[PDB]
């Protein structure tokens, strides 16, 4: 029985925009939960962030987490952008709302409920868990059931 919650995530998309999906594995309490869904029209980046979102939102108490992903988007966001975006009221240099702000605020709210340890894996060197996520993400995109509301060609 693990002393840390372990989460693995991946996202996939067939176009820009296109039908995509995500896969997430959550090792919580003494179970392994698997989340995966496809969306009819979305992007690779929204799907990546959605992976993280659904897994953290499943947590009911404050946890000590370790999140493993090979997503560059999440990494860039977490390590270089989010900090400056919270101080700027979630706007770009040119005062427009940041890209995927719906998702980044949503994620931001889920991150602040826990202690997070980020583990950036390499595309070709993750655990069997990351590969299973890649696999779920890809399966989901081939059979989209949901609508990705937040998506705009736009802002």
Active site includes 127?
Answer: no
Active site includes 124?
Answer: yes
Q: What is the SS3 assignment for 36-76? A: EEEEEEECHHHHHHHHHHHHHHCCCCCCEEEEEECCHHHHH
* List 30, 61, 89, 124, catalytic entry: 124
Active site includes 23?
Answer: no
* List 20, 21, 23, 70, catalytic entry: 70
Angle between helices 101-111 and 44-57 (to 10 degrees): 30
70 is in an annotated binding site: yes
Active site includes 10?
Answer: yes
Tokens of 16: 């820009």
Active site includes 70?
Answer: yes
* Burial class of residue 148 in the structure, from the number of CB atoms within 10 Å of its CB (0-12 exposed, 13-18 middle, 19+ buried): buried
10 is in an annotated binding site: yes
Active site includes 48?
Answer: yes
Rounded CA gap, 31 and 40, in Å? 30
* List 6, 10, 129, 148, catalytic entry: 10
* List 6, 11, 21, 148, catalytic entry: 11
48 is in an annotated binding site: yes
* List 77, 126, 129, 134, catalytic entry: 134
Residues acting as catalytic residues: 10-11, 48, 70, 124, 134
Q: Which residues are annotated as a binding site for Mg(2+)?
A: 10, 48, 70, 134
Q: Which residues are annotated as a binding site?
A: 10, 48, 70, 134
């Amino acid at each position: 029985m693990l002393k840390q919650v372990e989460i693995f995530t991946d996202g996939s998309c067939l176009g820009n925009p296109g039908p995509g999906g995500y896969g997430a594995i959550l090792r919580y309490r003494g179970r392994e939960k698997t989340f995966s869904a496809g969306y009819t029209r979305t992007t690779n980046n929204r799907m990546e962030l959605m992976a993280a979102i659904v897994a953290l939102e499943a947590l009911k108490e404050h946890c000590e987490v370790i999140l493993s992903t090979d997503s560059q988007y999440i990494r860039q966001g977490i390590t270089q952008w989010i900090h400056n975006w919270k101080k700027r009221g979630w706007k770009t240099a040119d005062k427009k709302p940041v890209k995927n702000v719906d998702l980044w605020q949503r994620l931001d709210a889920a991150l602040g409920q826990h202690q997070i340890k980020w583990e950036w894996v390499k595309g070709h060197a993750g655990h069997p868990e990351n590969e299973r996520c890649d696999e779920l993400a890809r399966a989901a995109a081939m059979n989209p059931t949901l609508e990705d509301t937040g998506y705009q060609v736009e802002v």
